């Protein structure tokens, strides 16, 4: 069986090699440069005692949720800086948070291996745990709402699952990874999603079928961060190699790599602008670099954090960028 | 230029801030500890006072200690160890009786000690089951020289043979700790029996010294 695997793997390598007639940079060589981009901190959100691990924007583009080591989940009003809610968490170790597309619910995850869904809008006027989802044998690295009922999670079990929150049991499990799944991103159409793992491979997943469509391998080390291009035909990865790579679903291969000899720190986060021309990456070097997605030329730097940047998010309308960090402050950039 | 509803929202935000500050001030008082031992080390048996993560609380001299034990993960710990870089200290428990496991224990200690995130954190090393170690050394059926040739030619700086063996085993870990030489973090070695009246006291003294060194560095005395 192993010998048969090599032939099919060799067939795949020839298939993607044959398609690479032109390079992305060759195609977009005659495109006007975006030039230097400058953004300044419009708002600095204070109130988190300890380091911030994760954040997520609401679809209304004004509210965001953040999770921190101090054991609190806080919903902010970005425009006015006010705190809408502050949720006490049973476990102080929280690796991820999510905000529902409707905004009625938020979710949580961490080393306790349980995903806790919170009901923001309720009679009696307090946030309460609607459901605690159990069934993962490892820490939850990420969680994202498809809708109010359904939520996908990724774990250190090397498995991802689709949960029905009303029933509280998994409806599908995704088992392709050979390492802890660090990140996931949902396609805009929601019919499919990607996952990144310490295996250093990214696999396209079909939510309805429960199978892996494609697998992408270009990273030497773990893939910390994953994001889908706004069109949905491509996605961008972040790893500990201090390089980001753009992959294309249809071509099934790499288009462009965003690497600079100056920087050696790993990429903690990646995000895309609304147009997709800009790729924003968060590093352990206490700063975020803005890349021209087409030309892979650095267009700017966002440096205001005294510690590493845990999370990075771009608003749905694309007006603002929010970056959390281990110094316990979130900054809105514009 | 703020509506009444916006003013009420701001007052609610300020009340939330006050409650968060109170909770943080309450949380600061406890000293947080991390307990790491691969297996057969008696890491649960170290402290007599008491699925993803196990938490233990013991109090000594009106000081609250939090000890976390993460046992639901694989042998590799690179990802979840990032969270525990704010801890006061890391408690490493190793069974000195089993000589075959000692090389793996030394490799684990080196990996923890040289981890980038845990560079600031000091370690408290409990060499455990010293009574079983002494019994094996007196019996002599198991030879330390076979596993580590250095013991066959060693001199000390409880029987003398047992003392030499225990000093040798301690010296390996102390040398791995000394190899860094940074001084920001120090390894405090101790020898613990299977049942010991006081280990929270030792942890308390080591945490007192750990905090004292940080105080000296902050006050620019060093």
């Amino acid at each position, epitope marked *: 069986l192993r010998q048969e695997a090599e032939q099919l793997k060799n067939q795949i390598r020839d298939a993607r090699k044959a398609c690479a007639d032109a390079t992305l940079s060759q195609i977009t060589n005659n495109i006007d440069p975006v030039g230097r981009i400058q953004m300044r901190t419009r708002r600095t959100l204070r109130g988190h005692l300890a380091k911030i691990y994760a954040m997520h924007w609401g679809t209304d583009s004004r*509210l965001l949720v953040s999770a921190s080591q101090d054991g609190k989940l806080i919903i902010w009003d970005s425009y006015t800086t006010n705190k809408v809610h502050a949720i006490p968490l049973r476990s102080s170790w929280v690796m991820t948070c999510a905000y529902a597309p409707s905004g009625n619910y938020v979710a949580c995850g961490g080393l306790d291996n349980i995903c806790s869904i919170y009901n923001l*809008k309720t009679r*009696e006027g307090n946030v309460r745990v609607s459901r605690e989802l159990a069934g993962h044998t490892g820490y939850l690295s990420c969680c994202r709402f498809l809708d109010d009922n359904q939520i996908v999670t990724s774990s250190g079990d090397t498995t991802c699952a689709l949960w029905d929150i009303e029933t509280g049991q998994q409806t599908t499990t995704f088992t392709g990874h050979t390492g802890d799944v660090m990140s996931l991103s949902l396609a805009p159409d929601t019919r499919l999603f990607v996952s990144g793992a310490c295996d250093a491979s990214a696999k396209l997943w079909d939510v309805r079928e429960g199978m892996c469509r494609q697998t992408f391998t270009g990273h030497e080390s773990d893939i910390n961060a994953i994001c889908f291009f706004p069109n949905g035909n491509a996605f961008a990865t972040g790893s500990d190699d201090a390089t980001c790579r753009l992959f294309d679903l249809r071509a099934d291969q790499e288009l462009m790599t965003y690497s600079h000899d100056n920087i050696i720190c790993g990429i903690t986060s990646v995000s895309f602008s609304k147009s997709g021309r800009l790729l924003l990456a968060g590093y352990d070097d206490f700063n975020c670099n803005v890349w021209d997605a087409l030309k892979a030329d650095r267009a700017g730097v966002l440096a205001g954090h005294d510690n590493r940047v845990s999370c990075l998010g771009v608003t749905d309308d694309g007006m603002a960028v929010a970056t959390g960090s281990w110094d316990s402050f979130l900054k809105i950039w514009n | 230029t703020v*509506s*009444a*509803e916006d003013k009420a929202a701001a*007052e609610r935000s300020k009340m939330i801030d006050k409650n968060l500050r109170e909770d943080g001030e309450k949380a600061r008082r406890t000293l947080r500890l991390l307990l790491l031992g691969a297996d057969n080390s008696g890491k649960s048996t170290i402290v007599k006072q008491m699925s993803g993560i196990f938490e233990t609380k013991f109090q000594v001299d009106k000081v609250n200690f939090h000890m976390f034990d993460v046992g639901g993960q694989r042998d590799e710990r690179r990802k979840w160890i990032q969270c525990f870089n704010d801890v006061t200290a890391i408690i490493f428990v190793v069974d000195s009786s089993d000589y075959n496991r000692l090389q793996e224990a030394l490799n684990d200690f080196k990996s923890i000690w040289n981890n980038r995130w845990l560079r600031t954190i000091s370690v408290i090393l409990f060499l455990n089951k010293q009574d079983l170690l002494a019994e094996k050394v007196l019996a002599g059926k198991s030879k330390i020289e076979d596993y580590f040739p250095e013991f066959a030619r060693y001199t000390t700086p409880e029987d003398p043979r047992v003392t030499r063996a225990k000093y040798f085993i301690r010296k390996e870990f102390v040398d791995i700790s000394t190899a860094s030489g940074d001084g920001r973090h120090i390894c405090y070695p101790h020898f613990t029996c299977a049942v010991d009246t006081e280990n929270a006291r030792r942890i308390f003294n080591d945490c007192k010294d750990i905090i004292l060194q940080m105080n000296l560095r902050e006050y620019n005395l060093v």
Partner: single-chain antibody
Amino acid sequence: VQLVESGGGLVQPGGSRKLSCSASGFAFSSFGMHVRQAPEKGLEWVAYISSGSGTIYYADTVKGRFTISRDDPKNTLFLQMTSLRSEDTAMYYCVRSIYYYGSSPFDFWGQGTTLTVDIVMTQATSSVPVTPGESVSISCRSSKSLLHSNGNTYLYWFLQRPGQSPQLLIYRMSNLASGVPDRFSGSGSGTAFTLTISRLEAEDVGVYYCMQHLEYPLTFGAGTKLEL
């Protein structure tokens, strides 16, 4: 959730009476608490006590006479009333209101207890003839524009059915309060607002009050009564 008012009955002029509303089933500390209806007049807002009692407001009619206080652990709100006059006779309502981005204040009202002893909001028609199954429209106006710079227009619509407390229908002129059928809609422009009911049915008959929350004191309209 429940708010049960206590105290009332006959009081001589110049006497003092304490009215208390006891809260059960909701987090009393988080909510700010507030309203009286005269025997033959629309609603009038008496006093407000914020969460934590940090902020207090009174109507100019009752300022210097009434005092509003909350004892959070027992979940009770008090109104200490002094120098009662003939005008003070009314039915007093205990109302809860929570203020954050997207909250629906004035959502729940108490039953109320009878006692026997500035933006001008105007409703055009005191009574409007209606028929079952026929769409109707209700109009209210503001002396001053209720649209704030931040973009929210602070207009609220309440419904008081016969023998029942007012119920919130629409908050901030467009949002529909939870538990309300979709038929109700709020279309509004600055200084002029309206409520539209489509497929009107029985049990939706009552006085429709328009309120402004732009600034204190809170003013209620006279209200428009619907009868089949």
